[PDB]
Amino acid sequence: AQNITARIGEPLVLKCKGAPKKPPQRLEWKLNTGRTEAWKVLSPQGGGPWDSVARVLPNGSLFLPAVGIQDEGIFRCQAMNRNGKETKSNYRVRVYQIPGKPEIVDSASELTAGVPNKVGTCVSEGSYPAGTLSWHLDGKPLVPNEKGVSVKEQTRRHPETGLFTLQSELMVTPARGGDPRPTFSCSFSPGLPRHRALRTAPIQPRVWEPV
């Protein structure tokens, strides 16, 4: 199966290998997606509630005006070149959506060395697939369970759009005598490398010493 990646809302055309450029053609598309209850067979004439979703073009290609999450799955075309030459097409379709730029909320103006502190919470909205948030300290990545560094993550899917909202709360135990002016930042990294990572504005808290 050939892997196809389309952006949500964008149109998609799937070629039918070995199909006559002009009608009439002996072919049938059969797809298994989030819209299909099982395997759905689409004929060149079509006809139904599928015409506004997935339509076979005069040249035999499968056309989707605007792909969505529900359209992820397998697309297969069995065409008949005049005779009895037969050609198969196998497509695995995955879709994606870029979230808005990640924001940091509830950030600490100051924090105290030697004890756990709540640095801030990173929030990313409107992404598909979910993806991951990652915190950075002065450029270098922070790793949980190591030196008082911990995160409180949660992923949430919108009931209608199916898009994801990410939340990452960072907690650090700053070393006494460490950097009094550290720089933190949160980055969003998508599932597939369809785009570059998105990074928050930096937060620059003060590190005070305990009495």
Side-chain angles (χ1 to χ4, degrees):
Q2 176 174 230
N3 287 266
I4 303 295
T5 302
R7 195 180 189 179
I8 297 181
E10 285 302 290
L12 181 61
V13 170
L14 299 175
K15 276 184 160 186
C16 197
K17 314 282 186 176
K21 343 250 182 174
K22 283 191 173 185
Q25 303 135 343
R26 180 62 50 78
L27 60 87
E28 61 172 15
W29 287 88
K30 51 152 51 186
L31 32 144
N32 194 333
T33 65
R35 299 202 195 276
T36 72
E37 309 193 57
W39 280 95
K40 177 56 185 179
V41 175
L42 300 188
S43 300
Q45 62 263 27
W50 276 96
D51 291 26
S52 43
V53 179
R55 188 75 176 275
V56 176
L57 300 179
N59 67 268
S61 286
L62 191 57
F63 172 70
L64 304 88
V67 294
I69 296 178
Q70 316 249 323
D71 292 319
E72 282 186 326
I74 304 301
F75 293 80
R76 285 172 182 169
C77 177
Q78 185 175 351
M80 206 83 167
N81 198 31
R82 223 83 65 235
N83 188 31
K85 253 82 171 184
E86 184 173 323
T87 308
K88 289 176 160 235
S89 300
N90 201 344
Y91 299 102
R92 194 172 198 246
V93 168
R94 291 290 174 267
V95 301
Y96 77 98
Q97 181 63 277
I98 312 178
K101 302 220 177 308
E103 311 168 19
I104 297 184
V105 301
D106 305 325
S107 59
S109 309
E110 270 84 13
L111 48 87
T112 310
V115 288
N117 292 133
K118 184 172 182 177
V119 169
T121 297
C122 191
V123 173
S124 180
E125 291 183 86
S127 74
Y128 190 87
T132 46
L133 294 178
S134 300
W135 286 91
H136 297 282
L137 173 56
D138 289 316
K140 289 191 173 183
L142 288 176
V143 183
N145 303 336
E146 303 174 1
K147 298 170 290 295
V149 177
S150 60
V151 274
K152 184 181 176 181
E153 307 178 9
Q154 66 171 219
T155 69
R156 193 186 306 272
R157 185 170 86 105
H158 195 290
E160 295 200 329
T161 57
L163 297 182
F164 291 98
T165 293
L166 306 187
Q167 275 201 47
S168 179
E169 168 196 315
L170 175 65
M171 289 230 221
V172 193
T173 66
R176 279 195 272 265
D179 189 21
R181 301 297 290 270
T183 293
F184 297 92
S185 65
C186 174
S187 281
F188 172 87
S189 298
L192 301 181
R194 293 304 294 132
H195 59 260
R196 178 199 43 185
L198 309 179
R199 187 196 60 204
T200 65
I203 51 184
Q204 296 155 330
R206 281 190 165 274
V207 180
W208 289 78
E209 295 295 333
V211 176

